[PDB]
From Swiss-Prot:
Phosphorylated on tyrosine residues on its extracellular part, promoting cleavage by secretase enzymes and formation of the soluble form (Angiotensin-converting enzyme, soluble form). It comes from the Eukaryota. Changing N475D: In Ndom123456 mutant; abolished dipeptidyl carboxypeptidase activity. Residues 11-590 form the Peptidase M2 domain. Changing E357D: Abolished peptidase activity, leading to increased levels of amyloid-beta. Inhibitors of ACE are commonly used to treat hypertension and some types of renal and cardiac dysfunction. Chloride 1 binds at Y197, R495. The active site is at E357 (proton acceptor 1), H486 (proton donor 1). The gene is ACE. Dipeptidyl carboxypeptidase that removes dipeptides from the C-terminus of a variety of circulating hormones, such as angiotensin I, bradykinin or enkephalins, thereby playing a key role in the regulation of blood pressure, electrolyte homeostasis or synaptic plasticity. Composed of two similar catalytic domains, each possessing a functional active site, with different selectivity for substrates. The record marks N489 as: Not glycosylated. It is linked to Ischemic stroke: A stroke is an acute neurologic event leading to death of neural tissue of the brain and resulting in loss of motor, sensory and/or cognitive function. Ischemic strokes, resulting from vascular occlusion, is considered to be a highly complex disease consisting of a group of heterogeneous disorders with multiple genetic and environmental risk factors. Renal tubular dysgenesis: Autosomal recessive severe disorder of renal tubular development characterized by persistent fetal anuria and perinatal death, probably due to pulmonary hypoplasia from early-onset oligohydramnios (the Potter phenotype). Glycans are attached at Q9, Q25, N45, Q82, Q117, Q284, N411, N475. This is Angiotensin-converting enzyme. The chain holds residues 30 to 639 of 1306 of the full protein.
């Protein structure tokens, strides 16, 4: 480490800790920036040289973190929790957790190389014919093809191409991660991840939430399985068993909005999927990002700065460069550079993804003047919910009419059911997947799931919660959890389950502050400066305040609560129950061993 980046001398009391934090800040911006810039150079141009430069930057960040981290524990470990400044408690508490910087040099190098190699395998994998990339090719197949065998070839090809080679790498990463965080006092890596929510009842609280939500998923599941049976027939759909995992519009069966045209309850009404109108009108990536920006400024939040438009990657590069296409938002920690990297496609669900990533950017813009250690969300679920809240207003048929994407307008019972069913395919279908992914990963980090059971325990949870089955046989040479971005790219997932409940709490509170008095699912907060100011208060706090207190100020309650979500969907919850009873459906999948057969002469066709 450069000496100029090393800590000097400070007293072991609150007065000294304030000076320690100020000196840390003045060097941390330089070290964080160089690491983000090297990650950006790699993710937008994957090459062996850019991976070497990124690993070099990661090693330096670990040297910085060890030096200031060791000094913080030596001076303040027994006293920082009683300091009178709550911002200072948070800064010192973060600095004394060293993470991967606890490892000796050789294991640090091994750790960084695994992260680089795992990212490469996932983002360059391809499916070659008897080659397709995940984005756009395989995504488009899973969303629009209605040929069972074509869908199967894409699903099987992808899970085999990405999952199989990742397994040996993921076993080594898990061991090294645990060794690192044990030295910060955590029993395993999953305990560190859960500690961010600062709640001793976290796991029990989540389970209780899912108990209230499960009847809504079971009824959506049965209704959709019936529609699939009408398309594919008894050979491929078992009305009392799990759904084959490749038929629901998405590589992970994680949201089902892309099969809306196959289940719409009242097909005679206006098409609430505006994708064909976007293409007809000539929308491109730039229009989508400017339309999202103008919603934010209608609320008197900030526009995107010049550095955002000059630096971002909003389309897949056409020079054939290899890139990480998975959509992501980037804070460079210098208060100036903020960017999105997205291989944007012109569709309705991509317009929602644009809003989701721009919600992250807006957070970065609002808290950039805090110390670096507090430039985070109140908890990670807050960060995921911001863009989704705005996107709930944008998708209302009334808002779509205002921005020219839906001409015909009606307010009748059948149109309400269509809209809420489409929104249920996006939000309710996701709940089991958002809940199960880190149940799997927490078991791996704790040792309850060793390598010999990675796939056995993944498919137990997938069938338990989602009611789906793999459409070809799997064994422990397969590593199907590894075929989902967040696993090889080491991003925690329970933030998305928290977000999908929390965003309806935010929507209800902002709709009230805007003076709206109709049904919750027809609220549009567009141009409400009062809602804007309420949201701005949350965003400017960063992680300076306990999240339970920020939530109480915003919505009137200091805990996660499913009731606003239930209220939003109530009309379609009742309708789906009534329909399934009339069709004599079985709720659930009591034939839990069932798998579909292979198509005739497969893969030859
Ligand atoms: C669409 O129509 C609904 C109500 O009409 C219909 O009722 C069903 C039979 C079906 O036909 C549905 O398609 C549809 O819901 C309108 O909702 C009504 O909005 C008004 C004003 O926004 C509400 O009045 C307020 O109610 C609150 C309750 O707390 C009071 O505090 C206020 O003082 C005020 O009285 C009314 O409650 C609400 N009715 C229902 C059943 O929700 C909706 O506005 C309309 N949407 C559009 C875009 O025109
Ligand atoms: C695990 O599965 C792979 C491949 O999947 C198999 O595909 C069919 C045979 C299906 O009916 C299922 O049995 C399996 O899931 C197996 O890889 C095969 O291995 C044998 C011998 O090792 C070889 O002759 C085949 O060519 C292989 N197939 C491929 C596609 O590589 C593997 O044997 C199964 N068992 C283990 C422990 O990995
Ligand atoms: C499309 C979205 N990409 C993530 C996100 O935006 O959350 C990306 C990759 C992982 C983190 N990340 C970031 O951009 C962070 N730098 C933001 C931050 O933490 O500040 C994604 O994965 N989503 C959307 C809902 C369901 C889930 C999914 O698609 O599975
Ligand atoms: C992608 O990254 C590579 C580095 O791996 C860049 O290649 C370098 O480009 C500079 C500028 O022309 C040359 O001076 C170097 O000799 C190149 N190095 C190597 C190893 O080829 C490349 O420019 C990047 N591509 C884009 C589009 O940014
Ligand atoms: Cl999280
Ligand atoms: Mg989709
Ligand atoms: Zn996000």
């Amino acid at each position: 480490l450069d000496p100029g980046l090393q800590p000097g001398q400070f007293s072991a009391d609150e007065a000294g800790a304030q000076l320690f934090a100020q000196s840390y800040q003045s060097s941390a911006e330089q070290v964080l920036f160089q690491s983000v810039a090297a990650s950006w150079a790699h993710d937008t141009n994957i090459t062996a040289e850019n991976a070497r430069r990124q690993e070099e930057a990661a090693l330096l960040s670990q040297e910085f973190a060890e030096a200031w981290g060791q000094k913080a524990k030596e001076l303040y470990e027994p006293i920082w929790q009683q300091f009178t400044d709550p911002q200072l408690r948070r800064i010192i508490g973060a600095v004394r957790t060293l993470g991967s910087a606890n490892l000796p040099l050789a294991k640090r190098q091994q750790y960084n190389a695994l992260l680089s190699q795992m990212s490469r395998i996932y983002s360059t994998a391809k499916v070659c014919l008897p080659c397709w990339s995940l984005d756009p090719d395989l995504t488009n197949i899973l969303a629009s093809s209605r040929s069972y065998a074509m869908l199967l070839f894409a699903w099987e090809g992808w899970h085999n191409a990405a999952g199989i080679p990742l397994k040996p790498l993921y076993e080594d990463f898990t061991a090294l991660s645990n060794e690192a965080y044990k030295q910060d006092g955590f029993t395993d890596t999953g305990a560190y991840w859960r500690s961010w929510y600062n709640s001793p009842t976290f796991e029990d609280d989540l389970e209780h939430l899912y108990q209230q939500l499960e009847p809504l998923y079971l009824n959506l599941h049965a209704f959709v399985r019936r529609a699939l049976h009408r398309r594919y027939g008894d050979r491929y759909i078992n009305l009392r068993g799990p759904i084959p995992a490749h038929l629901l519009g998405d590589m992970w069966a994680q949201s089902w909005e892309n099969i809306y045209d196959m289940v719409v309850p009242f097909p005679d009404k206006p098409n609430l999927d505006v994708t064909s109108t976007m293409l007809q009108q000539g929308w491109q990536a730039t229009h989508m990002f400017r339309v999202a920006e103008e919603f934010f400024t209608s609320l008197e939040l900030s526009p995107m700065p010049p550095e955002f438009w000059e630096g971002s990657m909003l389309e897949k590069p056409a020079d054939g460069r290899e890139v990480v296409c998975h959509a992501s938002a980037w804070d460079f920690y210098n208060r100036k550079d903020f960017r999105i990297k997205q291989c944007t496609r012109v569709t309705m669900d991509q317009l929602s993804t644009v809003h989701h990533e721009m919600g992250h950017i807006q957070y970065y813009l609002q808290y950039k003047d805090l110390p670096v250690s507090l430039r985070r969300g109140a908890n990670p679920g807050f960060h995921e919910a911001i863009g989704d809240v705005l996107a709930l207003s944008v998708s209302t048929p009334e808002h779509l009419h205002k921005i020219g994407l839906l001409d015909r307008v009606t307010n009748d019972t059948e149109s309400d059911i269509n809209y809420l069913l489409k929104m249920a395919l996006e939000k309710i279908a996701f709940l089991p997947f958002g809940y199960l992914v880190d149940q799997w990963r927490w078991g791996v980090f704790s040792g309850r799931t060793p390598p010999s059971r990675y796939n056995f325990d993944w498919w137990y949870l997938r069938t338990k919660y989602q009611g789906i089955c793999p459409p070809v046989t799997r064994n422990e040479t397969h590593f199907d959890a590894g075929a989902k971005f967040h696993v090889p790219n080491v991003t925690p997932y329970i933030r998305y389950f928290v977000s999908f409940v929390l965003q309806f709490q935010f929507h209800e509170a902002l709709c009230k502050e805007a003076g709206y008095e109709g049904p919750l699912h027809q609220c549009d907060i567009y141009r409400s400066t009062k809602a804007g100011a309420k949201l701005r208060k949350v965003l400017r706090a960063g992680s300076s305040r306990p999240w339970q207190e920020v939530l109480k100020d915003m919505v009137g309650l200091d805990a996660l609560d499913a009731q606003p979500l239930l209220k939003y969907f109530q009309l379609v919850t009742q309708w789906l129950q009534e329909q399934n009873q009339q069709n004599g459906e079985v709720l659930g999948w009591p034939e839990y061993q069932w798998h579909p057969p292979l198509p005739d002469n497969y893969p030859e066709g």
